[model samples]
Target: DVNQQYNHFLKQHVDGEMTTLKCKSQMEILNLNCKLKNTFILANPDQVQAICTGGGTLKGNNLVQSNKPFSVVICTHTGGESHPNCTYKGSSATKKVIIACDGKFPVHYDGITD
Candidate 1:
């Protein structure tokens, strides 16, 4: 169910006090989607989850936009060719973001609003 998946996704990617080393370590542990690039929201999971709780606006594509801006960390794959050895570089910013949702639960991160 979306509710369950969204919670797990937040545990894997959201950290209010995030660092490059933490990103590298966590991604290495989770190996999410074997993705080389990903973004982590620098916010309380509860705060982020609130965006899906009738606070977000849905666009035509069905992605939901956050009503408020949030700080985030972008983790780009740097050195490793694969997981376990995967390394990353972290960059930070504050912006309103969009995400894919299943009903009211956020399922996937889309991007920041222009």
Candidate 2:
């Protein structure tokens, strides 16, 4: 069964606007999910049927056994007229994740419009 802490986190923070750091945080969550999948596949070469994508609810027989909470990391990239090569990253536990661009550049909730 999934832990209660995750449920609480999801209910509380999953809907609000994530801060700038949410990009890197989301990435870490993704990476951690991958690692968990790999470990499960290795341990139960046959029983493990699918991998967790972190975007949806958990279901099926493959249970979430870890007590570690989920992490999130987000990243953004914008191209410029001459050389567009910008990136942003962070993480969050919210449901309604939004990425908006302002004045030709993406910005977080803290007014740090990148």
Q: Point to the candidate with the largest lDDT.
A: 1
lDDT of 2 at 101: 23
lDDT of 1 at 109: 83
Error of 1 at 12 (Å): 2.8
* Candidate 2 global Cα RMSD: 17.1
Q: After superposition, which runs of candidate 1 have C-alpha atoms over 4 Å from their true positions?
A: 32-34
Question: 12-110 in candidate 2: lDDT tens per residue?
Answer: 223334455544444344443221110001112111111133322222233222112223233543322222222333323322222222222212211
lDDT of 1 by residue, 1-114 (tens): 346778776876677887656666656766853567777888877777778787787785768898988888887777877656777787877889898777666777888875
Which sections of candidate 2 miss by over 4 Å?
A: 1-17, 34-74, 77-114
lDDT of each: 0.76, 0.28
Model 1 root-mean-square deviation: 2.5
RMSD of each: 2.5, 17.1
